[PDB]
Amino acid sequence: QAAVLAIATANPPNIFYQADYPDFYFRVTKSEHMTQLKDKFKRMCEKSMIRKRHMYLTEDVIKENPNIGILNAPSFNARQEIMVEEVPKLGKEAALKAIKEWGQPLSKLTHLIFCTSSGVNMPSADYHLAKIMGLPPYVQRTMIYQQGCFAGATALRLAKDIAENNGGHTRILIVCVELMVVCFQAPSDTYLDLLVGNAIFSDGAAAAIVGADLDTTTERPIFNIVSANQTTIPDSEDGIVGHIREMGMKYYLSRTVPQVIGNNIVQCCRDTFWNSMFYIVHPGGPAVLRMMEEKLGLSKERMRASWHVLSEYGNMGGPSVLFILDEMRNKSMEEGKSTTGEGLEWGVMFGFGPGLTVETVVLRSVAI
Amino acid sequence: QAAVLAIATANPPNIFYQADYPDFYFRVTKSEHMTQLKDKFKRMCEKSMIRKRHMYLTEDVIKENPNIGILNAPSFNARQEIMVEEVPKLGKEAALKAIKEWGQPLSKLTHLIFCTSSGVNMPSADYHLAKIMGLPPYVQRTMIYQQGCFAGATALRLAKDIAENNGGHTRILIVCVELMVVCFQAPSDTYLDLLVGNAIFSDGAAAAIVGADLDTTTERPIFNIVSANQTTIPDSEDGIVGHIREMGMKYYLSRTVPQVIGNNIVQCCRDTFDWNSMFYIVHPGGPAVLRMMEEKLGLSKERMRASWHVLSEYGNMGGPSVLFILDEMRNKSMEEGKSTTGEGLEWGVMFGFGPGLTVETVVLRSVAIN
Numbered sequence A: 001q002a003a004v005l006a007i008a009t010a011n012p013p014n015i016f017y018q019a020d021y022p023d024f025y026f027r028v029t030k031s032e033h034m035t036q037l038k039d040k041f042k043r044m045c046e047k048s049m050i051r052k053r054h055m056y057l058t059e060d061v062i063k064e065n066p067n068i069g070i071l072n073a074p075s076f077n078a079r080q081e082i083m084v085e086e087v088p089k090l091g092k093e094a095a096l097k098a099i100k101e102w103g104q105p106l107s108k109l110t111h112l113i114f115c116t117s118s119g120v121n122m123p124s125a126d127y128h129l130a131k132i133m134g135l136p137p138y139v140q141r142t143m144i145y146q147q148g149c150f151a152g153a154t155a156l157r158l159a160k161d162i163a164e165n166n167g168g169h170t171r172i173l174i175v176c177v178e179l180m181v182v183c184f185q186a187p188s189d190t191y192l193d194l195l196v197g198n199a200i201f202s203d204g205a206a207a208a209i210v211g212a213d214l215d216t217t218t219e220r221p222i223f224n225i226v227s228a229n230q231t232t233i234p235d236s237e238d239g240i241v242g243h244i245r246e247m248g249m250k251y252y253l254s255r256t257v258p259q260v261i262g263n264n265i266v267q268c269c270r271d272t273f274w275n276s277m278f279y280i281v282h283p284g285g286p287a288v289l290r291m292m293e294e295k296l297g298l299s300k301e302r303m304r305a306s307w308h309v310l311s312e313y314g315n316m317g318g319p320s321v322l323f324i325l326d327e328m329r330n331k332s333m334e335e336g337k338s339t340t341g342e343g344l345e346w347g348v349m350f351g352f353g354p355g356l357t358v359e360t361v362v363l364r365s366v367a368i
Numbered sequence B: 001q002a003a004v005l006a007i008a009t010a011n012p013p014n015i016f017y018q019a020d021y022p023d024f025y026f027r028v029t030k031s032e033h034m035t036q037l038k039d040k041f042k043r044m045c046e047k048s049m050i051r052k053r054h055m056y057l058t059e060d061v062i063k064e065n066p067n068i069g070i071l072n073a074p075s076f077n078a079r080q081e082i083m084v085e086e087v088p089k090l091g092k093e094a095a096l097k098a099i100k101e102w103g104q105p106l107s108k109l110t111h112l113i114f115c116t117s118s119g120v121n122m123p124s125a126d127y128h129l130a131k132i133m134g135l136p137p138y139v140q141r142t143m144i145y146q147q148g149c150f151a152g153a154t155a156l157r158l159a160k161d162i163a164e165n166n167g168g169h170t171r172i173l174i175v176c177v178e179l180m181v182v183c184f185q186a187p188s189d190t191y192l193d194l195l196v197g198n199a200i201f202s203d204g205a206a207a208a209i210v211g212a213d214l215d216t217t218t219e220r221p222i223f224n225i226v227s228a229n230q231t232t233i234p235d236s237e238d239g240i241v242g243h244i245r246e247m248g249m250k251y252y253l254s255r256t257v258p259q260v261i262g263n264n265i266v267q268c269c270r271d272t273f274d275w276n277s278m279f280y281i282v283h284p285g286g287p288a289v290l291r292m293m294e295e296k297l298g299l300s301k302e303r304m305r306a307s308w309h310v311l312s313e314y315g316n317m318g319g320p321s322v323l324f325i326l327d328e329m330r331n332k333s334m335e336e337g338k339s340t341t342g343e344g345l346e347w348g349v350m351f352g353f354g355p356g357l358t359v360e361t362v363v364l365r366s367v368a369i370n
């Protein structure tokens, strides 16, 4: 059975505290005159439950690429040149720490699964990561582009079958990275979905190692991947929409996504399995996390890891479910819990994104 | 063990005969005064070993989207809107014929793998296919974007482990589509990679069904997927390069790619496996790759027949091309009274390749027919 053997994360060094973003955003986009809009955007940042976000896109980067800060202006080439370089670099930072934890040589990896929705190139970010890390030429790459916030979960789904069907030697590095360079947009009166995305999206990278049939002398599972299944919510394609354009990516976030996602993953939870199991839910917004608490009647401690990653990092998209998994098993160990899943045995991870698409991973903890 | 249970293909109705393409291409781009450049382009087309290509991008579509035919003009938005709609539509045409040949209900599928380097969107082409085909919501989707001409083989590699690890009723639809709307560019005398790609790149869709441990009464494999491995060619990053830009995709094609590829897959054959006693499916990158296979392995001329055929009748369609060849090989083997689906031979190999340079090697096993 496939297991997660290591986790590690990385973030761009610059921190943006949510308190100061509504002024920073409207200032660098020369938009201070949209005061009524800014008041609305201040209202979104405060309700976001996000304390701080790490971002590559600093005021300097915008000055260097001034069209990114100018709505509808062509900025795709500029965004593209940044992301094609920087996405694999941030992925290398996290992958190195994850391989340090695994404690095995690079030449032991057989596969690489790279996921991002921040830039596209041929050869793609999976290749570039393998170059700058000097991976052997026998490492088999799978590139997951533009799958949004369920990419981290979908990587595990793919990794389970690769790891289990090829046997003991198969070892998979998974790397998910996002830079909101891809979709930063200046605020506008008619396009009210920016204010949502610009309040929540942030940058980060997470890496993980997956294998089955372990060398019990060197390798130790953190979690076991029991099952992994994707489902699609009918007639909801208008929920999350990403249009990649000459102005960069135009995202569109429907008001109904949190209730639609919330009702559906709460259903997946029942169909698949409530304070006796551990939970990793992609921090799409605070309302999805509350609905899990309200409809399953969870203690405040059940969603703690997911609220924590949201608060300290915001909505990093793809890699976010791995941040939460790392955060869960870390505090489990520091607090001396019974298991990597906060002392519990069974758990569930949910990724979700455009479609609407839900990726459900059934996990099992490891005794600590 | 995973097996290919059905294969089918589709292409745009408009046919562009290579003999006429230099005139067409320089006329619709209003570049016919670049007479020396056009002569060079004629020589490329005349050596392409491509007889005809099917293409979505007609003179009318250029007229409707004039920036596509103006070099460096902003046309990404125009290209995107075409491909986001037209890529799943053309994939649908192939997929339905593949399901028809399979003989099982569309609802019996469990997985969909969609591959294209022609447009990006969220939700992606895999979702849009599922929508317009009415695939049930339990069909689990994987989207392979921007992986170039090895995506068809990479889909078989991932589908092998999905079918065999889950097995049972697991059934994977693979759909690979390219439209050269993505990378069509007007000619320039400083940018001679464009002349190469404009002489060879074409449109098509292919669909295949994959499953392990199927029912003999209803389902019969065409090929068994014995193994599949991806390898990378070191220090070859600049061979095949695709820069997605506001002007569309700018590709760059090193002149040595066919030799690097040809020498690499000849070596892969030897490490992996009478070379005339196995069958071959080689991505039609150009004529030099196939001749290198024949030369360095001492192949009779029947061995690359199917790959030459697809190159001739369809050009370089990218990702789906190996499935076109696999289908052609299987069909003619049946029609011409051969003993197995691989031209009467037992073992075979499929090579896809693309940016990296990356090589996807799929070891195949024919099934007895006739």
Ligand SMILES: CC(C)(COP(=O)(O)OP(=O)(O)OC[C@H]1O[C@@H](n2cnc3c(N)ncnc32)[C@H](O)[C@@H]1OP(=O)(O)O)[C@@H](O)C(=O)NCCC(=O)NCCS
Residues within 6 Å of the ligand: A040, A043, A044, A045, A047, A048, A049, A149, A192, A193, A196, A199, A200, A240, A253, A254, A255, A256, A257, A258, A283, A284, A285, A286, A287, A288, A315
């Ligand atoms: C931004 C957010 C935190 C605001 O908190 P909230 O729970 O909506 O609380 P409120 O209803 O009081 O705030 C909504 C305000 O922002 C606007 N707004 C919120 N969501 C919006 C959306 N999808 N589209 C357009 N406007 C939106 C509303 O128009 C409203 O404006 P108002 O102050 O004039 O009334 C919340 O909307 C959110 O988290 N959205 C993200 C949804 C999500 O998880 N998507 C998944 C992507 S991975």
Ligand SMILES: CC(C)(COP(=O)(O)OP(=O)(O)OC[C@H]1O[C@@H](n2cnc3c(N)ncnc32)[C@H](O)[C@@H]1OP(=O)(O)O)[C@@H](O)C(=O)NCCC(=O)NCCS
Residues within 6 Å of the ligand: B040, B043, B044, B045, B047, B048, B049, B149, B192, B193, B196, B199, B200, B240, B253, B254, B255, B256, B257, B258, B284, B285, B286, B287, B288, B316
């Ligand atoms: C275009 C092609 C059909 C003709 O090449 P050929 O059969 O080897 O014969 P030639 O070398 O005489 O080519 C004729 C012209 O094309 C030019 N040319 C060939 N490859 C070129 C390249 N990468 N870049 C720029 N020019 C090139 C030559 O300079 C020559 O110009 P000239 O006639 O004025 O001297 C052949 O180059 C080809 O198929 N290349 C494919 C590359 C490839 O497979 N890429 C993989 C993507 S899947």
